[PDB]
Amino acid sequence: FLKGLPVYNKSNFSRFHADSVCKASNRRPSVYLPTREYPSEQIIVTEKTNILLRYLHQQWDKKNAAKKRDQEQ
Amino acid sequence: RREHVLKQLERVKISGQLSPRLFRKLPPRVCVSLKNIVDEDFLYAGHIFLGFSKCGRYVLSYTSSSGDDFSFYIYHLYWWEFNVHSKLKLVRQVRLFQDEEIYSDLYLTVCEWPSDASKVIVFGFNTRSANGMLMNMMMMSDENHRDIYVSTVAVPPPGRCAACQDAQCLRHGFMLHTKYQVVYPFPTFQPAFQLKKDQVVLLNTSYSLVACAVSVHSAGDRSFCQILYYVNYTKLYYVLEFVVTDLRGRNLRPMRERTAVQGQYLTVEQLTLDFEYVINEVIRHDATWGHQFCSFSDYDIVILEVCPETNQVLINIGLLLLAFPSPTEEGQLRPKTYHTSLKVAWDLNTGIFETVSVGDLTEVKGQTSGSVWSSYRKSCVDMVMKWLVPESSGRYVNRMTNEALHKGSLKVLADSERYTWIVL
Amino acid sequence: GPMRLYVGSLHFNITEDMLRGIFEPFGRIESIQLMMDSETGRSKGYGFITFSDSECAKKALEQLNGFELAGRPMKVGHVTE
Amino acid sequence: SYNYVVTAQKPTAVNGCVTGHFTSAEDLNLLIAKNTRLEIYVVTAEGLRPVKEVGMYGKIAVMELFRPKGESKDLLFILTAKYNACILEYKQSGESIDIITRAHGNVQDRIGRPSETGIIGIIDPECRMIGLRLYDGLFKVIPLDRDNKELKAFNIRLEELHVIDVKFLYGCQAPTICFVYQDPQGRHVKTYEVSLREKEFNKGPWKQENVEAEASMVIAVPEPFGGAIIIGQESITYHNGDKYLAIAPPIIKQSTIVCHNRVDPNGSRYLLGDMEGRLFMLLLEKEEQMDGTVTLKDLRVELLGETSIAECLTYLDNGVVFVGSRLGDSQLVKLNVDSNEQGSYVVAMETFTNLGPIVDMCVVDLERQGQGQLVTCSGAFKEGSLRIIRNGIGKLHIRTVPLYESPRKICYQEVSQCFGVLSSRIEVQDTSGGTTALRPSASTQALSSSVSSSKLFSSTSFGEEVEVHNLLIIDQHTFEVLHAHQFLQNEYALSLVSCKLGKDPNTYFIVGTAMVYPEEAEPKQGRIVVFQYSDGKLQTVAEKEVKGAVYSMVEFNGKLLASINSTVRLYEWTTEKELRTECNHYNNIMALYLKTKGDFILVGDLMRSVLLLAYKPMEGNFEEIARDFNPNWMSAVEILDDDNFLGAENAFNLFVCQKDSAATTDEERQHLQEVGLFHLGEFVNVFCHGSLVMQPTQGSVLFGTVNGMIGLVTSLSESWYNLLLDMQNRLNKVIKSVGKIEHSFWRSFHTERKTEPATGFIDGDLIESFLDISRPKMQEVVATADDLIKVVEELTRIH
């Protein structure tokens, strides 16, 4: 059949109950007020070189290596 | 199939996504006849309307009065007030290229910088330069030269500010003007690249590329030098009281002062890059065929990209040269004429230029020399179109042109942000 | 002037300034007319170029008719008016 | 002018929902993105256990969980609407809960225009890179490696300038993207191999394939099957090289599939969400190989039942799915093996309140006197309702009145003790040549009904959706639809007002309509109809034909002020009980919003900012006083006082422009200078002069947003502003931000044209956070008044 759905745990949703019908504006999660400072490992940065300027630069570096490998045939 | 306007409006309420890019397929909201908004009609001069400004508040126009007596033209620029269905109200009148003798009718273009709305630039060029003779009918033209007229004018203020009128006239009512001659192959006009960096203009004068920056500063001393944070560089200051530029407010030249001035001062910067020096350096240091090189006959420079963040200018150097063929001997090794291209990145901050790519030598087996530049320019158009990335609206270079007096068709003046047309 | 050419099958992003740049090396150009579409505000892909000398126009025609410009073969021909 | 913006109700619409193992390696978490709110839950026996709610300084545009090599548990990636990218980690030390910012930084580019389908963020299955589709013709690549101090991101040019959707494919040697793009030839599907070494695209494993013209979504099928699934309007396809399977079920042709969710970890079953709320099940028939690999045999879709109009679907555990709705209430549903009497396999377990979208509202003293109550028009389509919000002592109390159709406008008529509600229901044409209703709604279930018998406009397509507009007369106590007046065929009711006109002692219900024919797109004609609900029945008093759409309509000194397309017109109520034009104003583009105070009129234009008109009683005409010259695409306007005006634009910002006091010449008298700038992060549809508290500093303006957020705008004194500004700047030096996003940067006025710092506004949410922090870490006081409870606690009394 279409059913036989995954089970990460049989206990999940086995004791769930809410004595209400179509009413739940409870924003139960307590808000997080961070006051402690913990440094970051990395810093996300963008490559400033233009995409065309980058392509023309590496293509010229590959064209030089094709001619600069003539010490040996 | 086009969706109804009310259906689109309904969707905005429930989605919260409203943008001009979303409403692009939508027809214009309002289109007013030019005749209905213009005043003191009759035959009211020869006003050639250019178009809306990027802000959509100003509508520009110009006039080209000949004076049929000889004849030397006078070009005047105007700024009008758009108030939808109401009449246009003139806000600024300016004379362009003061004390300049214009023999032939100029093809002029008014431009705006991507984010600097405080000033506008006006390019102007003729088909050919005026000669030094006369052949009854007219003065005649020089087939080897062309005149280029560049001028920067300040935009009227949004309102208020420093109203220190010593009786009319104010703080930002400056004008700058220059003129240079060009040779064959006449440099290409690239306004989208030439003005990609705010307050700057890249000018091709055949012999070199000039980066000109014009800026005004007040009491504080935080921002200094746009260009150049060796090759030639000049920086001059002007207060009210190498391409030759003569400044003015609305009259004559303001007093050229120095750094010790207090109040308001204008700065003119010019960084030049000598083409022949660049060509010789690239061939000498980076060319693989440098040993075969003898001399170059002609060159043509085209801009490929301008990076306003890193202050880098990517140029392509089409070069006609004379060189010896490959060391292989099949007989007489007499030199031949070759065409090639050199790509160089020009750093505006440091002033140093770097070699990006060096082309191979293609033999010119008797080409018309005109076809060489026509083919080279097609490859530049091919390259730019190939690597074309759409930019943000409000970051574009607004180019305004109305070729009405030059055997040319303009019917609509559109403000594609407010969906407004001015039907001519 | 002596000759008026028809330039067609152009990419919509190709400008009049680009058209000038490609044709000007063949000779003196009297005028250029790249047709714009009023509604869109973009090009129609066709135009007219008038040379000051007939000879230059023919040479431009031979080297530009049927050759690719931005991947689309360009159409260059004679038009009286 | 100085103002104080505070939240009464936080946004409740669900924008994104994702599952993983974020708080612990064994915990099964559900993370909900509610605009700027990040709700973290743990799936237990009692259901969803609340953890914490992370308040981000930015709109959550991308939310994905990923686990790189040698990581204890899943890491979270957040990308804001202002391009603030960050990698977060959850850490709990017994009782102390803390979110660590592993990496952070802005990824915006000065070039590139934002894409039509918005920000798309995808992570490689082997956690080798992060792929971002921000702008047209570009694809940003963020490599993942904790070895380097920085994360050098770069752009790779994308030949396809109009990308619909993109995903990373599973079971590949090199990271491979699979996307659907549009061009003049139609829509196609393409793949590229991303090379981190060369920083470029390489030839995709499988190439060119002509897909449906309305192909909107891409599904990356996990490791066993491989390839991708493409969902369109008419068909669902499977692609994996020469392997191709396509199905055209007629059931999915009636409504657009807008969301999906993987049920099985191997990708055998997928849940599909519909615009109509129908829940589907996409089955992928397995075909095991003797090689050890697996293939696909068939594709089949099965209708499960009906749910809320879902934005995101998320399978939790043991046949229970979370339905994340933005146009209505969110649900917890159960997928059962046995279908009920209706033939539905899905049953609802719990329903979560969603007030958004708030399209219109009003403040009324319903029960008791002097205590205000908001009466909003919430939701859309079958999710449409009316919400009654009030500050109840013994915080907020909501009462839902389901309509089963989109409400549009609302007004109160106290003399009649009822509400006037404009509603719109969708009808489908059949083989009878007439339309039928999809479901019984409020307009079809009324006690008494009527149809418009007008002949002003004396002189369709099968299977096309048409809107049927009605005026609902709803009781104030029972909220039962007392009367439903059906307008003309192809007539849309846009504006609504309840007032007395001229010397007439009768209170009327005035409706502004517009004719929407399937032939023409432009609204060329409409009407202004005057109704009176005397005693249990509605009667048509008068009608005035107009040459356009009646957008806004407000009462003006016993007169009827209306906006018709680009015209702002004033009407007089004659002795014969007819409307007569007095004066007109034509200098507008799309006059959608009108607000009046005395003889002044604040005109809000959809594209041409705001404008101030003044009615001259002696002359009997309007006068253009001042204009806001800055280009703004308006959403809602409000009059603060005689000199200051409040506005809300399309870039989720608020602004306040005023009359220049230092102006000397008449041209300077016409310039409205913007003195207040603030980034709200919401899209305001309506402003209201009111307060939910029984009746420090003047001003009280309520506003409803698309996300269901309800806020307040109160005017502050220059002394109070300078105090609160210094306290706000001192609070940011003690209160930290998740993702290291500067508060000054977040609240900054940002548009695609300009960016300027926040001014003339105070973030009330940040000020009131002073009460929640610990006593020792409250040293924002450097002169004494250590006990700053007299302030803030008095500021919280405005709610």
Ligand SMILES: Cc1ccc(NS(=O)(=O)c2ccc(CN)cc2)c2[nH]cc(C#N)c12
């Ligand atoms: C190669 C080239 C490049 C650019 C030119 N102009 S631009 O105004 O800078 C420009 C226009 C349109 C786009 C993209 N839509 C990009 C730049 C040019 N003008 C004559 C040229 C030649 N030859 C030429």
